[PDB]
């Protein structure tokens, strides 16, 4: 059949592709721009994967449209235009596995996040990736090509001048730079790191969720024993674990504790004097500040961290349609490479896994749009507009 045919198909695929990926990725950048709720450093990272994704749709699907065609290129200019897309997914790589981290440090040190995580410091790590992914994603330009053994008689089939070969992703990048280095070491290794870290982040989740119930659940059985104390040594134990737990959760609100720590204080010295029934008396009165303030401590401790608990299953979901998308083509490497008595995967397969892969710098604005109010406002926001 005409190779124009098949090739129009993809070509064509290919440039919708790109039109969406530069539209969606631009309305991100666009309101993390307007939108000083959106200016923290998380999204930063969202914008610098963005940004990748936008140069997917102005460069990488460009150039995959050219080297489809098999044109004839001095070997050096072909690497480029076949590594340049390594460089934007290591990029995003980066992003996300910065995403994870800052999620993780949110989770685990909300007191010291601030502190540690600044604007200038996310600005400083992002141009660093961005260097390190050009590095990375460009490591064939430094000699690992296959450019000291061109295929003559490709390049004569096609017309090709001196010193030029039919620019061929497979002829010019060596497989075992692109499953040892790039798929192994600089995109698994990340991606299994990045499993790691989405793991603690929701098992820190779950045990200060459980702690929030415990110490709630301990303060309300605690009452119970003095109300149920035979003689004031009973009351006084079970107040000296109040006070303990009370001190240990506070490390309108401020107010509360006060209260309650003092309340504690007050039963405790008259458990002390022997004064059973009044220290029981004393204790009842933890009821009223348990109802008007500690409750509602509680509630909005809970809240956040159920918060925390959806922000990190929308960047996990945005992490793993990253791997989704891309795991095709890197599977596809395996086989070629580690199977060289199996027939190479077809030619419409290879376009299928590399539209899929390009796939990927569509969806992450439709995630945010459904997943993250503040996005989603600031979308409608910039279409009404
Ligand atoms: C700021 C942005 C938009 C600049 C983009 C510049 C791009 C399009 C340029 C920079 C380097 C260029 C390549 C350098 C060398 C060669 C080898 C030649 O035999 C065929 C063209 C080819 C493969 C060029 C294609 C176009 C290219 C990739
Ligand atoms: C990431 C998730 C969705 C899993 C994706 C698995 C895909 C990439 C797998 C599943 C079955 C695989 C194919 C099974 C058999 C062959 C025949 C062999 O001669 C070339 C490779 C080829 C054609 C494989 C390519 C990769 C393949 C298509
Ligand atoms: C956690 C998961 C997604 C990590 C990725 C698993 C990858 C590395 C696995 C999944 C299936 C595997 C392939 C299954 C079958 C074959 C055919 C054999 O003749 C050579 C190895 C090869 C080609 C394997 C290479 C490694 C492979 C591609
Ligand atoms: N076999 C291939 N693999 C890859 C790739 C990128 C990341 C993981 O695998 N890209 C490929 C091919 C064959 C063609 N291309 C490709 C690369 C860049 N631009 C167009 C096509
Ligand atoms: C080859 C073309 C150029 C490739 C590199 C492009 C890099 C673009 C990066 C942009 C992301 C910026 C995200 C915001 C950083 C923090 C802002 C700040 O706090 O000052
Ligand atoms: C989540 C990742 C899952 C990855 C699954 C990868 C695909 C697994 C299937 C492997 C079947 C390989 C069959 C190769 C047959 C070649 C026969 C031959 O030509 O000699
Ligand atoms: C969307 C599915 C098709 C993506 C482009 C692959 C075309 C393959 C072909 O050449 O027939
Ligand atoms: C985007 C869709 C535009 C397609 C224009 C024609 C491309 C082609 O068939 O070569
Ligand atoms: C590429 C496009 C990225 C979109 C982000 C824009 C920054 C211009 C700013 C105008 C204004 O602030 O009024
Ligand atoms: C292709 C490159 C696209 C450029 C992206 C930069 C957009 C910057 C928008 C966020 C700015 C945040 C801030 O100023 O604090
Ligand atoms: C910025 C937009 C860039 C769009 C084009 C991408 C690169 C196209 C390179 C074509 C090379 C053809 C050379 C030849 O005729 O041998
Ligand atoms: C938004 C600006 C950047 C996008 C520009 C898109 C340009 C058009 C798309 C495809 C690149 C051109 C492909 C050239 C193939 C040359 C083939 C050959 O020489 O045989
Ligand atoms: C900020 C824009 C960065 C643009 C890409 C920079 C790196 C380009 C790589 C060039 C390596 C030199 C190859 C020379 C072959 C002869
Ligand atoms: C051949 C390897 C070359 C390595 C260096 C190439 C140039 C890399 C620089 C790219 C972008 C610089 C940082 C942009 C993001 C700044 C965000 C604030
Ligand atoms: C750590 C990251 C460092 C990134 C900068 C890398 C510097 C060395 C790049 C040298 C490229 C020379 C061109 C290669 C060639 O022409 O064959
Ligand atoms: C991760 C470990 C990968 C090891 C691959 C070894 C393959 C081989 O020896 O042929
Ligand atoms: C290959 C594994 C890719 C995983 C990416 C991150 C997904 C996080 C999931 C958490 C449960
Ligand atoms: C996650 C960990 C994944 C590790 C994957 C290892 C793949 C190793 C494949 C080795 C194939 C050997 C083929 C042969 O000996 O002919
Ligand atoms: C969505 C559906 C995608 C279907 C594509 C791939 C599934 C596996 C097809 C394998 C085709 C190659 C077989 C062969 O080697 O002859
Ligand atoms: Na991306």
């Known amino acids: 059949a005409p190779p124009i045919m098949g090739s129009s198909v993809y070509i064509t695929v290919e440039l919708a592709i790109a039109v969406l990926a530069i539209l969606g990725n631009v309305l991100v950048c666009w309101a993390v721009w307007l939108n000083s709720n959106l200016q923290n450093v998380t999204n930063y990272f969202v914008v610098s994967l963005a940004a990748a994704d936008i140069l997917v749709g102005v460069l990488a699907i460009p150039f995959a449209i050219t080297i489809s065609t098999g044109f004839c290129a001095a070997c050096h200019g072909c690497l480029f235009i076949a590594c340049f897309v390594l460089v934007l997914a290591q990029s995003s790589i980066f992003s996300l596995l910065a995403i994870a981290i800052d999620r993780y440090i949110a989770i685990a040190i909300p007191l010291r996040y601030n502190g540690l995580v600044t604007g200038t410091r996310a ?149 002390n004097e022997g004064k059973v029934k009044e220290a029981q008396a004393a204790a009842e009165q933890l009821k009223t500040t348990r109802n008007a303030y500690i409750q509602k401590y509680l509630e909005r401790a809970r809240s956040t961290l159920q918060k925390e608990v959806h922000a990190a299953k929308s960047a996990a979901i945005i992490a793993g349609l990253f791997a989704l998308c891309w795991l095709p083509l890197h599977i596809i490497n395996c086989f070629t490479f580690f199977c060289p008595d199996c027939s190479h995967a077809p030619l419409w397969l290879m376009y299928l896994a590399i539209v899929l892969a390009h796939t990927n710098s569509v969806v992450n604005p439709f995630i945010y749009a459904y997943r993250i109010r503040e996005f989603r406002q600031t979308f409608r926001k910039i279409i009404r507009s």
């Open 123 to 271: 600005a400083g790590i992002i141009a660093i990736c961005w260097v390190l992914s050009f590095a990375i994603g460009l490591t064939p330009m430094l000699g690992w090509n296959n450019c000291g053994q061109p295929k003559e008689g490709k390049a004569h089939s096609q017309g090709c001048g001196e010193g030029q070969v039919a620019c061929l992703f497979e002829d010019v990048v060596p497989m075992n730079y692109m499953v040892y280095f790039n798929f192994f070491a600089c995109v698994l290794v990340p991606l299994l790191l990045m499993l790691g870290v989405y793991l603690r982040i929701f098992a820190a989740a779950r045990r200060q969720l459980a702690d929030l119930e415990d110490n709630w659940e301990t303060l309300n059985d605690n009452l119970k024993v003095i109300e149920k104390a035979d003689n004031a040594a009973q009351v006084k134990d079970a107040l000296t674990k109040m006070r303990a737990a009370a001190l240990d959760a506070q490390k309108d609100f401020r107010h509360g504790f006060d209260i309650l720590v003092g309340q504690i204080d007050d039963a405790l010295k008259l458990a």
